[PDB]
Design an enzyme around this catalytic site. Structure first.
Site, short mmCIF file in Angstrom:
data_model
loop_
_atom_site.label_atom_id
_atom_site.label_comp_id
_atom_site.label_asym_id
_atom_site.label_seq_id
_atom_site.Cartn_x
_atom_site.Cartn_y
_atom_site.Cartn_z
CE1 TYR A 85 -3.83 2.31 0.22
CE2 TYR A 85 -2.90 3.11 2.30
CZ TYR A 85 -3.83 3.23 1.28
OH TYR A 85 -4.75 4.27 1.32
NE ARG A 90 -1.31 5.57 0.80
CZ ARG A 90 -0.60 5.47 1.91
NH1 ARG A 90 0.39 4.61 1.99
NH2 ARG A 90 -0.84 6.27 2.94
CG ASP A 91 -7.05 7.67 -0.23
OD1 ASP A 91 -7.96 6.87 -0.56
OD2 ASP A 91 -7.21 8.45 0.75
CB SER A 97 -5.28 7.01 3.18
OG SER A 97 -5.73 6.59 4.48
CG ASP A 137 -9.21 2.28 -1.44
OD1 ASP A 137 -10.13 1.45 -1.21
OD2 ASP A 137 -8.76 2.98 -0.48
CG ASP A 316 -11.61 4.33 8.39
OD1 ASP A 316 -10.89 3.31 8.16
OD2 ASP A 316 -12.78 4.17 8.85
#
Ligand SMILES: CO[C@@H]1O[C@H](CO)[C@@H](S[C@@H]2O[C@H](CO)[C@@H](O[C@@H]3O[C@H](CO)[C@@H](O[C@@H]4O[C@H](CO)[C@@H](N)[C@H](O)[C@H]4O)[C@H](O)[C@H]3O)[C@H](O)[C@H]2O)[C@H](O)[C@H]1O
Ligand SMILES: CO[C@@H]1O[C@H](CO)[C@@H](S[C@@H]2O[C@H](CO)[C@@H](O[C@@H]3O[C@H](CO)[C@@H](O)[C@H](O)[C@H]3O)[C@H](O)[C@H]2O)[C@H](O)[C@H]1O
Ligand code: NAG
Length: 361
Positions: A85, A90-91, A97, A137, A316
């Site tokens: 991850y 990212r995200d 995140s 994701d 989260d």
């Protein structure tokens, strides 16, 4: 052809244990909650390689511990559960995140090196059965979020780096599951066919690596495996739980050359319906509980295991509106607050999950 969850015990890593024992328990006086917290610390959830620094430290440490236990005679042998991850950008459809690397600052090269190093470490620990979830994701965002500038801008990179990871981590003792969103994301009738097209094409373009076992669903979300009636927030999706999603998704994937087996996150699925006002409310949702414990005994031919991917208690996203990583989903009425940064311990959330645990602790 083997289910990687059969014939092994799952190692419970010491990082989650340490969070619960050093952070949570000292703040929980209540005798029953304290005992419950000690028990959940031993449920084997996935360990996340969320930053590059974890590769040569935490990953090595876990694999070294497993090796030692197995050499001493552990029966069944222990297996590791790891999440990869750290994609650059990212995200891409959220703020909470965002990661350490950016495509515009050598992120692609940084990521290839990270994957190469993980490969070297897994080769050195080829005696330890290793199960991997690849990039929660990422591909789901490529299905539904091309309208988001960060996601459209990252799409070609995500595709290149996913194929890179699938080939490089295709090792004899590894099983990989690509992240595939969840029933309320890709399982919607309008999303499910283009999802199947994308995952099967990535699989084919990667050369159908032997180590790719299938897909992971419900990671860091709350959906039921199987409930008798749709939760209100799921209407009008006919795929209102993970079983419906998987039973609809698998035929479409298989018809396109990818006969995916599935694992399903149930770590925060114990209470159904949840307290989500809308299904797309993913951040620190109220009214959730620890769910079915990890097991290979799923009773379903397409599902290798129920798993705990997201470790319940790890936040989260921050609810601090002034923070860089503030995402409006984390300020909503059905998000528990105040919440620290994503990944940091959220003790009040952990307590909620214990209270609502089903089966209970
Ligand atoms: C007929 O009713 C309407 O139908 C349409 C579809 O035809 C949907 S539109 C559909 O809505 C879903 C919400 O139910 C969307 O799913 C959400 O997508 C977001 C990404 O944009 C996901 O967020 C991500 O969640 C991760 C945890 O699962 C988290 N780690 C990430 O940081 C976060 O970005 C979310 O989980 C998911 O539920 C879907 O994209 C969209 O196509 C309409 O809602 C109905 O009313
Ligand atoms: C989808 O959101 C991600 O969720 C994953 C799983 O919860 C986390 S990974 C999580 O990250 C935190 C923060 O990096 C780690 O906690 C930290 O561990 C380091 C040692 O590595 C300590 O120095 C530090 O005190 C501690 O807070 C967890 O161990 C990981 O599991 C991710 O961050 C989210 O974005
Ligand atoms: C990632 O960590 C490795 C050690 O595992 C290190 O050598 C490398 O420099 C790090 N990458 C970046 C971009 O700093």
């Amino acid at each position: 052809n083997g289910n990687p969850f059969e014939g092994v015990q799952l190692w419970a890593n010491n990082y989650y244990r340490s969070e619960v024992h050093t952070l949570a328990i000292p703040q929980i006086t209540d005798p029953a909650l304290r005992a419950a917290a000690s028990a959940v610390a031993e449920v084997p959830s996935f360990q996340w390689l969320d930053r590059n620094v974890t590769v040569d430290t935490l990953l090595v440490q876990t694999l070294s511990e497993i090796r030692e236990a197995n050499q001493a005679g552990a029966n069944p042998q222990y297996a590791a559960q790891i999440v990869v991850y750290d994609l650059p950008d990212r995200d891409c459809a959220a703020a909470a995140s965002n990661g350490e690397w950016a495509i515009a600052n050598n992120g692609v090269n940084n990521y290839k090196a990270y994957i190469n190093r993980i490969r070297e470490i897994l080769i050195s620990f080829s005696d330890v059965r290793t199960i991997l979830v690849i990039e929660p994701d990422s591909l789901a965002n490529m299905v539904t979020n091309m309208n988001v500038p960060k996601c459209s801008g990252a799409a070609s990179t995500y595709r290149e780096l996913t194929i890179y990871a699938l080939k490089q981590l295709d090792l004899p003792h590894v099983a990989m599951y690509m992240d595939a969103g969840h029933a309320g994301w890709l399982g919607w009738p309008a999303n499910i066919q283009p999802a199947a097209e994308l995952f099967a094409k990535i699989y084919e373009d990667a050369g159908k690596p032997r180590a790719v076992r299938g897909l992971a669903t419900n990671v860091a979300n709350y959906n039921a495996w199987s409930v008798s009636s749709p939760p209100p927030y799921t209407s009008p999706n006919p795929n209102y739980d993970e079983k419906h999603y998987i039973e609809a998704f698998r035929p479409l994937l298989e018809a396109r050359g990818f006969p995916a087996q599935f694992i399903v996150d149930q770590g925060r699925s114990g209470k159904q319906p949840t307290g989500q006002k809308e299904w797309g409310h993913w951040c620190n949702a109220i009214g959730t509980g620890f769910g079915m414990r990890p097991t290979a005994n799923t009773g379903h031919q397409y599902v290798d295991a129920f798993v705990w991917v997201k470790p319940g208690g790890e936040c989260d996203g921050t609810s601090d509106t002034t923070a860089a990583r503030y995402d409006y989903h984390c300020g909503l009425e059905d998000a528990l607050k105040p919440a620290p940064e994503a990944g940091q311990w959220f003790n009040e959330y952990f307590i909620q999950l214990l209270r609502n645990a089903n089966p209970p602790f």
